[PDB]
Write a protein that holds these residues in place. Structure first.
Motif, PDB file in Angstrom:
ATOM      1  N   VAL A 113      25.639  22.613   5.740  1.00 41.45           N
ATOM      2  CA  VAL A 113      26.201  21.646   4.800  1.00 41.45           C
ATOM      3  C   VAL A 113      25.239  21.413   3.642  1.00 41.45           C
ATOM      4  CG1 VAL A 113      26.796  19.219   4.511  1.00 41.45           C
ATOM      5  CG2 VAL A 113      27.749  20.518   6.430  1.00 41.45           C
ATOM      6  N   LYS A 114      23.946  21.268   3.947  1.00 37.98           N
ATOM      7  CA  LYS A 114      22.953  21.088   2.893  1.00 37.98           C
ATOM      8  C   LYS A 114      22.988  22.247   1.906  1.00 37.98           C
ATOM      9  CE  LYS A 114      19.137  18.717   3.873  1.00 37.98           C
ATOM     10  NZ  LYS A 114      19.633  18.687   5.277  1.00 37.98           N
ATOM     11  N   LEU A 115      23.199  23.465   2.404  1.00 37.55           N
ATOM     12  CA  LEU A 115      23.159  24.670   1.590  1.00 37.55           C
ATOM     13  C   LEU A 115      24.503  25.017   0.965  1.00 37.55           C
ATOM     14  CD1 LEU A 115      21.061  26.769   4.099  1.00 37.55           C
ATOM     15  CD2 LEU A 115      20.268  26.118   1.811  1.00 37.55           C
ATOM     16  N   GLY A 116      25.552  24.252   1.254  1.00 37.43           N
ATOM     17  CA  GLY A 116      26.880  24.615   0.798  1.00 37.43           C
ATOM     18  C   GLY A 116      27.425  25.853   1.474  1.00 37.43           C
ATOM     19  N   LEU A 117      27.015  26.110   2.714  1.00 39.39           N
ATOM     20  CA  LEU A 117      27.409  27.299   3.458  1.00 39.39           C
ATOM     21  C   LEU A 117      28.149  26.930   4.739  1.00 39.39           C
ATOM     22  CD1 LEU A 117      24.040  29.217   3.039  1.00 39.39           C
ATOM     23  CD2 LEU A 117      26.147  29.682   1.775  1.00 39.39           C
ATOM     24  N   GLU A 118      28.815  25.771   4.745  1.00 35.95           N
ATOM     25  CA  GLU A 118      29.495  25.306   5.947  1.00 35.95           C
ATOM     26  C   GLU A 118      30.589  26.263   6.405  1.00 35.95           C
ATOM     27  OE1 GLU A 118      29.426  24.059   2.825  1.00 35.95           O
ATOM     28  OE2 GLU A 118      30.851  22.399   2.656  1.00 35.95           O
ATOM     29  N   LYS A 119      31.055  27.159   5.529  1.00 32.29           N
ATOM     30  CA  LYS A 119      32.053  28.145   5.929  1.00 32.29           C
ATOM     31  C   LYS A 119      31.549  29.084   7.016  1.00 32.29           C
ATOM     32  CE  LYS A 119      30.794  30.169   1.557  1.00 32.29           C
ATOM     33  NZ  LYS A 119      30.281  31.509   1.155  1.00 32.29           N
ATOM     34  N   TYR A 120      30.242  29.115   7.270  1.00 29.27           N
ATOM     35  CA  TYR A 120      29.652  29.992   8.273  1.00 29.27           C
ATOM     36  C   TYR A 120      29.304  29.256   9.561  1.00 29.27           C
ATOM     37  CZ  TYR A 120      29.308  32.941   4.146  1.00 29.27           C
ATOM     38  OH  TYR A 120      29.605  33.670   3.014  1.00 29.27           O
ATOM     39  N   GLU A 121      29.773  28.016   9.718  1.00 24.05           N
ATOM     40  CA  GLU A 121      29.702  27.357  11.016  1.00 24.05           C
ATOM     41  C   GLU A 121      30.338  28.231  12.089  1.00 24.05           C
ATOM     42  OE1 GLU A 121      31.155  23.226  10.988  1.00 24.05           O
ATOM     43  OE2 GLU A 121      30.346  23.103   8.949  1.00 24.05           O
ATOM     44  N   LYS A 122      31.515  28.783  11.785  1.00 20.74           N
ATOM     45  CA  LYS A 122      32.196  29.671  12.719  1.00 20.74           C
ATOM     46  C   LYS A 122      31.307  30.845  13.102  1.00 20.74           C
ATOM     47  CE  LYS A 122      37.083  30.038  13.288  1.00 20.74           C
ATOM     48  NZ  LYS A 122      36.831  28.645  13.756  1.00 20.74           N
ATOM     49  N   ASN A 123      30.672  31.471  12.107  1.00 17.76           N
ATOM     50  CA  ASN A 123      29.815  32.623  12.371  1.00 17.76           C
ATOM     51  C   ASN A 123      28.681  32.263  13.321  1.00 17.76           C
ATOM     52  OD1 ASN A 123      31.124  32.700   9.626  1.00 17.76           O
ATOM     53  ND2 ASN A 123      30.416  34.828   9.737  1.00 17.76           N
ATOM     54  N   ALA A 166      19.903  39.287  12.748  1.00 16.95           N
ATOM     55  CA  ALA A 166      20.765  38.374  13.490  1.00 16.95           C
ATOM     56  C   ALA A 166      21.897  37.860  12.608  1.00 16.95           C
ATOM     57  CB  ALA A 166      19.939  37.214  14.046  1.00 16.95           C
ATOM     58  N   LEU A 167      21.561  37.368  11.412  1.00 18.73           N
ATOM     59  CA  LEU A 167      22.588  36.865  10.506  1.00 18.73           C
ATOM     60  C   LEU A 167      23.545  37.970  10.079  1.00 18.73           C
ATOM     61  CD1 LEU A 167      20.250  34.575   8.394  1.00 18.73           C
ATOM     62  CD2 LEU A 167      21.936  33.838  10.088  1.00 18.73           C
ATOM     63  N   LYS A 168      23.048  39.201   9.932  1.00 20.00           N
ATOM     64  CA  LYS A 168      23.934  40.324   9.636  1.00 20.00           C
ATOM     65  C   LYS A 168      24.915  40.559  10.778  1.00 20.00           C
ATOM     66  CE  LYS A 168      23.192  44.533   6.890  1.00 20.00           C
ATOM     67  NZ  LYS A 168      22.879  44.433   5.434  1.00 20.00           N
ATOM     68  N   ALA A 169      24.435  40.491  12.023  1.00 20.82           N
ATOM     69  CA  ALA A 169      25.326  40.636  13.167  1.00 20.82           C
ATOM     70  C   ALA A 169      26.343  39.507  13.242  1.00 20.82           C
ATOM     71  CB  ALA A 169      24.512  40.694  14.460  1.00 20.82           C
ATOM     72  N   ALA A 170      26.041  38.352  12.651  1.00 17.67           N
ATOM     73  CA  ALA A 170      26.974  37.238  12.581  1.00 17.67           C
ATOM     74  C   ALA A 170      27.912  37.335  11.383  1.00 17.67           C
ATOM     75  CB  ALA A 170      26.207  35.914  12.537  1.00 17.67           C
ATOM     76  N   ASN A 171      27.901  38.462  10.668  1.00 15.09           N
ATOM     77  CA  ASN A 171      28.834  38.710   9.569  1.00 15.09           C
ATOM     78  C   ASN A 171      28.627  37.731   8.415  1.00 15.09           C
ATOM     79  OD1 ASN A 171      30.293  40.883  10.944  1.00 15.09           O
ATOM     80  ND2 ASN A 171      31.112  39.255  12.257  1.00 15.09           N
ATOM     81  N   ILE A 172      27.378  37.360   8.172  1.00 16.84           N
ATOM     82  CA  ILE A 172      27.016  36.475   7.064  1.00 16.84           C
ATOM     83  C   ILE A 172      26.568  37.340   5.891  1.00 16.84           C
ATOM     84  CG2 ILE A 172      25.326  34.799   6.249  1.00 16.84           C
ATOM     85  CD1 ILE A 172      25.458  33.865   9.388  1.00 16.84           C
ATOM     86  N   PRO A 173      27.152  37.174   4.701  1.00 19.55           N
ATOM     87  CA  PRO A 173      26.863  38.106   3.594  1.00 19.55           C
ATOM     88  C   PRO A 173      25.433  37.975   3.097  1.00 19.55           C
ATOM     89  CG  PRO A 173      28.915  36.893   3.220  1.00 19.55           C
ATOM     90  CD  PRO A 173      28.184  36.192   4.322  1.00 19.55           C
ATOM     91  N   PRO A 174      24.977  38.925   2.274  1.00 16.89           N
ATOM     92  CA  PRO A 174      23.550  38.933   1.891  1.00 16.89           C
ATOM     93  C   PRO A 174      23.054  37.636   1.271  1.00 16.89           C
ATOM     94  CG  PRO A 174      24.592  41.016   1.318  1.00 16.89           C
ATOM     95  CD  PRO A 174      25.702  40.089   1.737  1.00 16.89           C
ATOM     96  N   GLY A 175      23.726  37.130   0.240  1.00 19.80           N
ATOM     97  CA  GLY A 175      23.281  35.937  -0.443  1.00 19.80           C
ATOM     98  C   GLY A 175      23.017  34.783   0.503  1.00 19.80           C
ATOM     99  N   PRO A 176      24.045  34.379   1.251  1.00 22.74           N
ATOM    100  CA  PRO A 176      23.844  33.302   2.233  1.00 22.74           C
ATOM    101  C   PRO A 176      22.728  33.589   3.224  1.00 22.74           C
ATOM    102  CG  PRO A 176      26.186  33.679   1.882  1.00 22.74           C
ATOM    103  CD  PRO A 176      25.465  34.757   1.114  1.00 22.74           C
ATOM    104  N   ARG A 177      22.523  34.852   3.610  1.00 26.94           N
ATOM    105  CA  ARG A 177      21.408  35.168   4.497  1.00 26.94           C
ATOM    106  C   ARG A 177      20.083  34.732   3.880  1.00 26.94           C
ATOM    107  NH1 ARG A 177      24.059  40.334   5.438  1.00 26.94           N
ATOM    108  NH2 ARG A 177      22.345  41.435   4.395  1.00 26.94           N
ATOM    109  N   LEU A 178      19.885  35.020   2.590  1.00 23.26           N
ATOM    110  CA  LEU A 178      18.641  34.636   1.929  1.00 23.26           C
ATOM    111  C   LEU A 178      18.464  33.124   1.914  1.00 23.26           C
ATOM    112  CD1 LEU A 178      18.929  37.130  -1.026  1.00 23.26           C
ATOM    113  CD2 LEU A 178      17.008  37.091   0.585  1.00 23.26           C
ATOM    114  N   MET A 179      19.529  32.387   1.591  1.00 28.72           N
ATOM    115  CA  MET A 179      19.425  30.934   1.520  1.00 28.72           C
ATOM    116  C   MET A 179      19.110  30.344   2.890  1.00 28.72           C
ATOM    117  SD  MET A 179      22.692  30.531  -1.036  1.00 28.72           S
ATOM    118  CE  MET A 179      22.834  28.746  -1.052  1.00 28.72           C
TER     119      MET A 179
END
Ligand SMILES: [Cl-]
Length: 64
Positions: A11-21, A39-52
């Motif tokens: 939520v802090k990062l504006g990435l709450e859409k990846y709660e499911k992931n 790990a984040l790649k295996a969770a199907n989280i795209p590159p940008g959000p992975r960095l954040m």
């Protein structure tokens, strides 16, 4: 399992859409300090959000 801290970070990062992931990959709160790009790649989280996310872990003192 506990996913509340991970939710707070997303939520802090504006990435709450990846709660499911996180829930799907079992990225529970005890994993937060351990998160890797792979790990984040295996969770199907795209590159940008992975960095954040990985940058937030490296900076937040409340992440055990
Ligand atoms: Cl990718």
């Amino acid at each position: 399992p506990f996913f509340t801290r991970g939710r707070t970070m997303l939520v802090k990062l504006g990435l709450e859409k990846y709660e499911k992931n996180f829930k799907k990959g079992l990225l529970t709160d005890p994993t937060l300090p351990l998160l890797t790009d792979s790990a984040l790649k295996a969770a199907n989280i795209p590159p940008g959000p992975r960095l954040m996310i990985l940058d937030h872990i490296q900076r937040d003192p409340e992440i055990k």
